[PDB]
Design an enzyme around this catalytic site. Structure first.
Site, short mmCIF file in Angstrom:
data_model
loop_
_atom_site.label_atom_id
_atom_site.label_comp_id
_atom_site.label_asym_id
_atom_site.label_seq_id
_atom_site.Cartn_x
_atom_site.Cartn_y
_atom_site.Cartn_z
N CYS A 221 0.95 -1.17 0.01
CA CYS A 221 0.08 0.05 0.03
C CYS A 221 0.95 1.16 0.06
O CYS A 221 1.58 1.59 -0.97
CB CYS A 221 -1.04 0.11 1.29
SG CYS A 221 0.02 -0.45 2.82
N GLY A 224 3.07 -0.12 3.46
CA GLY A 224 2.86 -1.67 3.62
C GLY A 224 2.60 -2.37 4.75
O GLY A 224 3.34 -3.38 5.20
N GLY A 226 -0.57 -1.21 7.26
CA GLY A 226 -1.96 -1.02 7.49
C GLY A 226 -2.78 -2.05 6.62
O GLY A 226 -3.45 -2.95 6.80
N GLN A 265 -2.56 -1.82 10.94
CA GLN A 265 -2.03 -0.63 11.75
C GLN A 265 -2.83 -0.13 12.86
O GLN A 265 -2.24 0.51 13.87
CB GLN A 265 -1.35 0.31 10.85
CG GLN A 265 -0.65 1.52 11.52
CD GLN A 265 0.02 2.53 10.32
OE1 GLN A 265 -0.71 2.77 9.45
NE2 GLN A 265 1.23 2.91 10.73
#
Length: 284
Positions: A221, A224, A226, A265
Site C-alpha cells: 500500500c 505496507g 496497514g 496498523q
C-alpha cells in the site's frame, strides 16, 4: 493454535462489538504489545546507506524476515529492500509485504519481483490520496519502460468500478514472464471502506489469480503495514474458512506481527477485518 468454528466466530464478533466495542479495543491492544519485548532487529533498514530506500523512516523491515536482493557489483547494501516475507494460510512466505516503491527503489522493486518469481502484485492504495503522495508510479503508463535490467511492458488494462487490473510482461536483459497487478482504486482518504463487499470481491479475485506454484504474492500500500496487513489477514482467513470452516484472526495477526512491523496498523482496520469476514460468512 485456537481455531474457532465459523458459528462460534460469528457470535464472537457480536461480543467484540458489545459494550462500546470493548473487545476490539482489548484485542488490538494485545496485538500492539505482542512483540514489544522481542528485541526484533532491523539493522539494515536503519543503516545510513539504506535511508533513502525507506518510504517512512520509522516503518522498518525486520532483519530475520526481510526479502534479500542478490548482491550487486560496485555497494554492499545493494541487497536491501523495505520488504518482508509474511505467512499466509498453511503456507510460509505466501506474501511479500512491502512499502509503495520510491523512484529511487524502482529497480530494486522489479529485481525483487524477478528474483522472487512473483506473478501477482496487489496494490491497495492510489498514487496520491487527499493531496498527499502515497506511492510513486513504478509501471509504464503505456507500452514499455526500463528499470535497470528489467524491461516492463504494459499489455492490458481492465478498469472495474472499485479496482483496476493491469497485465505486464517482464523480461530480464541479463517478454519472458507475466506479472498481473490488482490495484484497488476506491479506498477512502480517511479511514476504512464503508462496505466490505467490494473489498471481498477484490480479495477473492486477486487471490484466485495466484497460480501454482509460483513466487510469493507481493502486497503493498503506502507503508505496507496497514492496508497490506488487512488484505493478508482477510485473504488467509477466507482460505481457512473454505478449508476448515474455522477462523482465528487474533492468533494469526499476532503471528505475522513478528514478520513485519505494524501489519494491520489501526483498530479501525482490525474491526473492518471482522465486518468483512462476517459478510463473507453470511453470504455463501
Amino acid at each position: 493454535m485456537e481455531a474457532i468454528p465459523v458459528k462460534q466466530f460469528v457470535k464472537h464478533i457480536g461480543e467484540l462489538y458489545s459494550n462500546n466495542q470493548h473487545g476490539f479495543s482489548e484485542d488490538f491492544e494485545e496485538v500492539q504489545r505482542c512483540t514489544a519485548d522481542m528485541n526484533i532487529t532491523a539493522e539494515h533498514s536503519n543503516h545510513p546507506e539504506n535511508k533513502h530506500k525507506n518510504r517512512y523512516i520509522n516503518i522498518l523491515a525486520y532483519d530475520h524476515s526481510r526479502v534479500k536482493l542478490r548482491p550487486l557489483p560496485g555497494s554492499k547494501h545493494s541487497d536491501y529492500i523495505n520488504a518482508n516475507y509474511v505467512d499466509g494460510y498453511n503456507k510460509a512466505k505466501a506474501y511479500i509485504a512491502t512499502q509503495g516503491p520510491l523512484k529511487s527503489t524502482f529497480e530494486d522493486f522489479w529485481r525483487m519481483i524477478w528474483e522472487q518469481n512473483t506473478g501477482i502484485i496487489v496494490m491497495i492504495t492510489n498514487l496520491v490520496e487527499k493531496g498527499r503522495r502515497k506511492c510513486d508510479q513504478y509501471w509504464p503508463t503505456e507500452n514499455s519502460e526500463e528499470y535497470g535490467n528489467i524491461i516492463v511492458t504494459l499489455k492490458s488494462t481492465k478498469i472495474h468500478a472499485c479496482y483496476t487490473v493491469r497485465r505486464f510482461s517482464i523480461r530480464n536483459t541479463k517478454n519472458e514472464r507475466v506479472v498481473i497487478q490488482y490495484h484497488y482504486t476506491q479506498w477512502p482518504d480517511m479511514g476504512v471502506p464503508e462496505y466490505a463487499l467490494p473489498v471481498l470481491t477484490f480479495v477473492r479475485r486477486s487471490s484466485a489469480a495466484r497460480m501454482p506454484e509460483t513466487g510469493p504474492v507481493l502486497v503493498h500500500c503506502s507503508a505496507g503495514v496497514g492496508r497490506t496487513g488487512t488484505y493478508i489477514v482477510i485473504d488467509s482467513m477466507l482460505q481457512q474458512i473454505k478449508d476448515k470452516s474455522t477462523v482465528n484472526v487474533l492468533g494469526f495477526l499476532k503471528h505475522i506481527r513478528t514478520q513485519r512491523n505494524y501489519l494491520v496498523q489501526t483498530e479501525e482496520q482490525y474491526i473492518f477485518i471482522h465486518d468483512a469476514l462476517l459478510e463473507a460468512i453470511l453470504g455463501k
